[PDB]
């Protein structure tokens, strides 16, 4: 319907795509680095989610330049996506309040 709802939907789909690609790319970037732990896909996908939500427990993280670059993309995609949802909620509340005031 409205632009904000559409944008929020698209952002969520975009995020899921970034989570999957980031998981795949993180493993590709980290294998070959002695000591790295972000090296199998199941846990890499878990890592991508706790990174996108900015929780970052510290159980897993990248040690290489390219793994870190991948991490930044996931971080920004998560922060932006969740932020966009907040903006969509605000727009919805603002429209409803204008109606309620009879504006």
């Amino acid at each position, epitope marked *: 319907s409205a632009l904000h709802w559409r944008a929020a939907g698209a952002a969520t789909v975009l995020l899921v795509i970034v989570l999957l690609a980031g998981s795949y790319l993180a493993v590709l970037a980290e294998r070959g680095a002695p000591g790295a*732990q972000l*090296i199998t*896909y199941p846990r890499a996908l878990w890592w991508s989610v706790e990174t996108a939500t900015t929780v970052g427990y510290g159980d897993l993280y990248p040690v290489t330049l390219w793994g870190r670059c991948v991490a930044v993309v996931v971080m920004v995609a998560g922060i932006t996506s969740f932020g966009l949802v907040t903006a969509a909620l605000a727009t919805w509340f603002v429209g409803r309040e204008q109606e309620r005031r009879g504006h």
Partner: antibody
Amino acid sequence: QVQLQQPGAELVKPGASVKLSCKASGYTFTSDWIHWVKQRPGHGLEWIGEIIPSYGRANYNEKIQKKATLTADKSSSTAFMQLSSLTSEDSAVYYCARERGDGYFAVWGAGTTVTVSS
Amino acid sequence: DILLTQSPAILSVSPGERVSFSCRASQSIGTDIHWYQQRTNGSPRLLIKYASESISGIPSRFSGSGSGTDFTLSINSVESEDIANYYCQQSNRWPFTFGSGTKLEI
């Protein structure tokens, strides 16, 4: 059916090189990695390296002298290992194994016995 | 690189008795340990994954346990076909590494 097919043997003259092959069957995923393991007679298993066919990137064991170069042919679903300038120290059984990106070697090839002799 | 220590190198047991193989990691690796069986002239065969997960087609007398640095592969009532070399392998940190192996004698 046999998931990984490797030739039974290869005779190599000292100083020369050889190209081992590992043909894969069964399910193939973008997350699959093909590994190579070396086993000298009477000795244990030694990891040589790995390659991800979907991207073509390979990594190698840093603890040993690099004698191998890994490549893969996506169309023929075959992984290759080029061993160069071999010595008698390189005589052994070389296995290829498939890992689904989750850390363990689910299936192994029969192994190729490489003998370095004149 | 993670060092996996398997000791003793040879384990002697009477037929039908329970036996346990030891694998110790140089640092804590959760449950990222896998076990393989290799008979004379054969290729390694996956027995247990992630320390204790059973694999389809593997006899029920095979089980694994442990976490952290100490792991164990156990065989309830060992039999002739169990005669082989057993190896542990870790996938917690790059690169993957193998233990030196333990031989089972009856």
